[PDB]
Amino acid sequence: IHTILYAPNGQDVEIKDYEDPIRDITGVNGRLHVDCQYSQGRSSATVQY
Amino acid sequence: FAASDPEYVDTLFREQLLEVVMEGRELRKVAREASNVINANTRVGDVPIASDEEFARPTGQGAEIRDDGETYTTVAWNATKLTEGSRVTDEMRDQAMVDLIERNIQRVGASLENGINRVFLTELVDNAQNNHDTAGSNQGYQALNSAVGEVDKDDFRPDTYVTHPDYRTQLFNDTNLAYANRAGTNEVLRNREDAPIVGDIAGLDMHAAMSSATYDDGTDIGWSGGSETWGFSSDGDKGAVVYDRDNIHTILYAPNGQDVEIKDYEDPIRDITGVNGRLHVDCQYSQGRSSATVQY
Amino acid sequence: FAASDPEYVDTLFREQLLEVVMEGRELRKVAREASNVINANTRVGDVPI
Amino acid sequence: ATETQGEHTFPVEVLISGEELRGYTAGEALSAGEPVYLSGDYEVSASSADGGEFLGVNLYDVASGEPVALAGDDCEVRVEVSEQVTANDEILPDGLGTFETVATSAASAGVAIVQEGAASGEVCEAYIFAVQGTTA
Amino acid sequence: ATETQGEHTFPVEVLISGEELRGYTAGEALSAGEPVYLSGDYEVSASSADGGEFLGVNLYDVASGEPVALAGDDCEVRVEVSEQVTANDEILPDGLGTFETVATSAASAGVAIVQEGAASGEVCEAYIFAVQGTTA
Numbered sequence: 001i002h003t004i005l006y007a008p009n010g011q012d013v014e015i016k017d018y019e020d021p022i023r024d025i026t027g028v029n030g031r032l033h034v035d036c037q038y039s040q041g042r043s044s045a046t047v048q049y
Numbered sequence: 050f051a052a053s054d055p056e057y058v059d060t061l062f063r064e065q066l067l068e069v070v071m072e073g074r075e076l077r078k079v080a081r082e083a084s085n086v087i088n089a090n091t092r093v094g095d096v097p098i099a100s101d102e103e104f105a106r107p108t109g110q111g112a113e114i115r116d117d118g119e120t121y122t123t124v125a126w127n128a129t130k131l132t133e134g135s136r137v138t139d140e141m142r143d144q145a146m147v148d149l150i151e152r153n154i155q156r157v158g159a160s161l162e163n164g165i166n167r168v169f170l171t172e173l174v175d176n177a178q179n180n181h182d183t184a185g186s187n188q189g190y191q192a193l194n195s196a197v198g199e200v201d202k203d204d205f206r207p208d209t210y211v212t213h214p215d216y217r218t219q220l221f222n223d224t225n226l227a228y229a230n231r232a233g234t235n236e237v238l239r240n241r242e243d244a245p246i247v248g249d250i251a252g253l254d255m256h257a258a259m260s261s262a263t264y265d266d267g268t269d270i271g272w273s274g275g276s277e278t279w280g281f282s283s284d285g286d287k288g289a290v291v292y293d294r295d296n297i298h299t300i301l302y303a304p305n306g307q308d309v310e311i312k313d314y315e316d317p318i319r320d321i322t323g324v325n326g327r328l329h330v331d332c333q334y335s336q337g338r339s340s341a342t343v344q345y
Numbered sequence: 346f347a348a349s350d351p352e353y354v355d356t357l358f359r360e361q362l363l364e365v366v367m368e369g370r371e372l373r374k375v376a377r378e379a380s381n382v383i384n385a386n387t388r389v390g391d392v393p394i
Numbered sequence: 395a396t397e398t399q400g401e402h403t404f405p406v407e408v409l410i411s412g413e414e415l416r417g418y419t420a421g422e423a424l425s426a427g428e429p430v431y432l433s434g435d436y437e438v439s440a441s442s443a444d445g446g447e448f449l450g451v452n453l454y455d456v457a458s459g460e461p462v463a464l465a466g467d468d469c470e471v472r473v474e475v476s477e478q479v480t481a482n483d484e485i486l487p488d489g490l491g492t493f494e495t496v497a498t499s500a501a502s503a504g505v506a507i508v509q510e511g512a513a514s515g516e517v518c519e520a521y522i523f524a525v526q527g528t529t530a
Numbered sequence: 531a532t533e534t535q536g537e538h539t540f541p542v543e544v545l546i547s548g549e550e551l552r553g554y555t556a557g558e559a560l561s562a563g564e565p566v567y568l569s570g571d572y573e574v575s576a577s578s579a580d581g582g583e584f585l586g587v588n589l590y591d592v593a594s595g596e597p598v599a600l601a602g603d604d605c606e607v608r609v610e611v612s613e614q615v616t617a618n619d620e621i622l623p624d625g626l627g628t629f630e631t632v633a634t635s636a637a638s639a640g641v642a643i644v645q646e647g648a649a650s651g652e653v654c655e656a657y658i659f660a661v662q663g664t665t666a
């Protein structure tokens with residue numbers, strides 16, 4: 001099972017801080033691109049009630 | 050069968066995407082060679098113009114040397130800001146095989162240069178004091194000859210011709226002129242090395258071959274239009290300008306440095322990178338009687 | 346709109362293909378441990394009973 | 395919208411200027427330059443005619459259920475028109491993935507203003523100034 | 531406007547997105563998420579019903595005479611409603627510190643578009659797109 005992480009500016013979660021000097025606000029924002037995918041779905045079993 | 054690329058074309062490898070992006074239609078960049086370039090300190094200004102030269106006076110011995118001093122006037126420049134931008138997402142900037150920022154820097158640069166060329170060509174065509182009307186006859190060489198004739202008749206030395214694609218079809222219809230520098234002098238010096246030495250025509254040492262699209266007909270977005278029709282297809286179309294390149298001035302203003310300014314921005318709220326370009330440009334004849342247009 | 350992935354997914358870049366090929370089903374290999382192994386001198390031979 | 399340059403077709407850049415770029419989910423398949431309205435909670439679908447259905451223009455092609463970006467008001471945009479538009483014409487969605495003039499629609503006010511005129515089926519340059527929703 | 535997480539009630543963050551944040555003076559005591567209009571020179575009071583009285587929404591609690599931050603048009607906001615709103619409903623001030631639909635009000639055009647629907651007394655998510663002053 002593969003967790004696929006895409007980051008434009010690095011490896012992982014990008015946290016960008018911005019300063020608005022017109023309003024005196026600091027922004028903190030974060031981004032990641034994520035998918036998840038099996039290479040072999042036969043390598044897993046769900047347990048069902 | 051076995052294992053071949055037609056089966057696994059997306060499975061075991063990717064089709065190549067070439068790291069080089071091939072160009073669109075490129076319009077002919079001439080203005081920097083085809084005019085005198087002024088790096089202005091100010092967006093608005095004026096260039097001093099001197100009075101025409103006269104002749105010294107037959108004078109007696111011990112007689113007063115008389116005054117005919119240089120009298121002066123001026124032509125104004127008012128440099129218009131030409132701008133182009135491009136935006137790219139961070140995801141797009143990262144994923145591209147091509148350097149997308151470098152390309153956008155090229156596109157912006159190219160688009161600004163086309164702007165300079167538009168300003169130049171519009172000024173050159175609109176404000177030429179002389180004109181050879183062909184009246185639908187003797188077009189091509191007799192017209193170029195007559196247009197040199199008009200500049201020279203008014204005691205200016207033409208050294209350059211700017212030409213439309215249709216005029217370049219009427220000129221060079223003669224097999225005598227086949228060895229001429231039809232490509233443009235700037236094209237041969239930019240995009241070749243071994244220039245054919247013979248190629249100069251009518252004592253004009255520059256051919257500034259220019260594009261159909263370059264003149265300001267006001268049909269383009271944000272452009273207001275010039276007085277003439279750039280072409281060689283209907284009565285009244287200006288197909289060429291014969292002139293002195295030292296008597297038309299391209300005035301370039303930039304607040305930072307001397308030439309095109311590229312700025313970039315990162316938007317962290319939207320994850321967009323922008324590239325912006327700017328230059329301020331005017332074009333002015335110092336003497337417009339140094340130039341003749343060829344009219345269909 | 347500006348340049349973006351969904352517009353230029355197959356014109357400015359290629360979708361990644363992973364450098365590692367992921368393995369299929371591995372069958373259990375036990376016969377050599379699970380039996381008497383004869384490294385025979387001949388392709389045909391007899392065992393006395 | 396698309397641009398023919400010889401043998402080539404190019405995508406038209408929907409966004410001329412502005413930063414009113416906002417995230418929604420596509421309620422149907424949407425194409426770049428298409429006008430849209432809210433069909434559900436943060437879910438957007440293609441606008442119908444005669445107003446009351448406009449939030450912005452779709453920035454890039456999306457399938458149903460995918461995250462979409464829209465240009466909203468205070469964006470200048472490149473958009474396709476179903477009729478001749480001159481400068482200063484107010485425009486709103488035609489219901490055909492394109493825009494029409496307020497003058498042609500049954501609506502009395504628009505959502506964008508034409509800055510650069512265009513013929514039928516061609517790209518105008520317009521400024522988005524309003525959103526339109528359900529008034530009863 | 532307030533949010534529940536177990537036994538706890540939390541103050542709702544009025545601003546989802548936008549930068550149209552502007553300084554006024556309070557003409558009266560105002561609460562967060564309250565719709566407001568100009569009552570004097572750079573001075574804002576809480577809106578009455580039926581339109582003509584909207585500049586934005588108040589971003590934090592102020593006493594009378596204090597400096598207010600206002601979210602104008604171009605802001606996505608969490609706002610309280612007096613009735614059921616669906617997405618794509620136009621809303622305007624109710625007169626009760628809340629928003630109501632254009633459909634319910636005696637007015638015919640709104641000031642925000644509902645992006646996420648809500649029941650009566652709950653918090654919708656809206657985009658402010660218009661201002662209403664006096665027209666006589």
Ligand SMILES: [K+]
Pocket residue numbers: 467468523603604659
């Ligand atoms: K606005």
Ligand SMILES: [Mg+2]
Pocket residue numbers: 113
């Ligand atoms: Mg004397």
Ligand SMILES: [Mg+2]
Pocket residue numbers: 103117
């Ligand atoms: Mg004199």
Ligand SMILES: [Mg+2]
Pocket residue numbers: 094095125126
């Ligand atoms: Mg002056």
Ligand SMILES: [Mg+2]
Pocket residue numbers: 178179199203
């Ligand atoms: Mg003359």
Ligand SMILES: [Mg+2]
Pocket residue numbers: 182184284285345
């Ligand atoms: Mg004539």
Ligand SMILES: [Mg+2]
Pocket residue numbers: 225
């Ligand atoms: Mg011969």
Ligand SMILES: [Mg+2]
Pocket residue numbers: 389390391
């Ligand atoms: Mg045997």
Ligand SMILES: [Mg+2]
Pocket residue numbers: 413414415547548549604
């Ligand atoms: Mg915004």
